[PDB]
Design an enzyme around this catalytic site. Sequence first.
Site, PDB file in Angstrom:
ATOM      1  N   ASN A 160      -0.819  -2.567   4.116  1.00 35.72           N
ATOM      2  CA  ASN A 160      -2.055  -2.981   3.451  1.00 35.72           C
ATOM      3  C   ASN A 160      -3.247  -2.000   3.639  1.00 35.72           C
ATOM      4  O   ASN A 160      -4.393  -2.439   3.854  1.00 35.72           O
ATOM      5  CB  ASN A 160      -2.470  -4.428   3.786  1.00 35.72           C
ATOM      6  CG  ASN A 160      -3.594  -4.988   2.883  1.00 35.72           C
ATOM      7  OD1 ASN A 160      -4.456  -5.795   3.305  1.00 35.72           O
ATOM      8  ND2 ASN A 160      -3.495  -4.728   1.582  1.00 35.72           N
ATOM      9  N   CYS A 162      -2.595   1.723   2.214  1.00 32.44           N
ATOM     10  CA  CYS A 162      -2.554   2.699   1.180  1.00 32.44           C
ATOM     11  C   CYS A 162      -2.362   2.129  -0.211  1.00 32.44           C
ATOM     12  O   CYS A 162      -3.260   2.267  -1.040  1.00 32.44           O
ATOM     13  CB  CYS A 162      -1.531   3.783   1.500  1.00 32.44           C
ATOM     14  SG  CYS A 162      -2.059   4.613   2.993  1.00 32.44           S
ATOM     15  N   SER A 170      -1.235  -1.504  -1.433  1.00 30.38           N
ATOM     16  CA  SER A 170      -1.673  -2.830  -1.881  1.00 30.38           C
ATOM     17  C   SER A 170      -3.164  -2.849  -2.213  1.00 30.38           C
ATOM     18  O   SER A 170      -3.557  -3.497  -3.151  1.00 30.38           O
ATOM     19  CB  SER A 170      -1.218  -3.997  -0.991  1.00 30.38           C
ATOM     20  OG  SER A 170      -1.627  -3.785   0.337  1.00 30.38           O
TER      21      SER A 170
HETATM   22  O1  VO4 Z   1       1.970   0.014   3.532  1.00 27.30           O
HETATM   23  V1  VO4 Z   1       0.667   0.584   2.748  1.00 27.30           V
HETATM   24  O2  VO4 Z   1      -0.769   0.599   3.455  1.00 27.30           O
HETATM   25  O3  VO4 Z   1       0.836   2.099   3.536  1.00 27.30           O
HETATM   26  O4  VO4 Z   1       0.905   1.406   1.390  1.00 27.30           O
END
Ligand code: VO4
Length: 157
Positions: free
Chosen positions: A15, A17, A19
Amino acid sequence: AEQVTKSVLFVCLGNICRSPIAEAVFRKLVTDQNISDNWVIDSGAVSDWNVGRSPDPRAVSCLRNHGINTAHKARQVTKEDFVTFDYILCMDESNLRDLNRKSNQVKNCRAKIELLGSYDPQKQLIIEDPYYGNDADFETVYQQCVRCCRAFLEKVR
Ligand code: VO4
């Protein structure tokens, strides 16, 4: 002006990159369609590792290039999300295995859980983790979320 209120939760591991990119894009779409008041939108993580952190700086600047801004703090996905959201959309099959597992832990699971990429007209199922990438990979991710979310909305609209 009156319809039903619809809800979508966008999910990634961290949460930080992806989302938040998919969430912010989706907000801009709804806002642009004059349909915000009918939508509840949010993003969350499978993992608790980054709760409270702000979106990656690369995601941030990338959204800016496109005139989009976000104020998201990272939060973890919870059991009530499965009862409250109409849709949970994730980035990869791992995100997907993990949510299904957790969903079982719920009796009354009303959420449809699916890969965001399953909406892609270009068929790229998977939205790759750009963390170790550079700035052009974030741009590539933004591009995919745009395709997917535009296609998602139009069929749930
Ligand atoms: O799991 V995410 O914050 O890296 O895209």
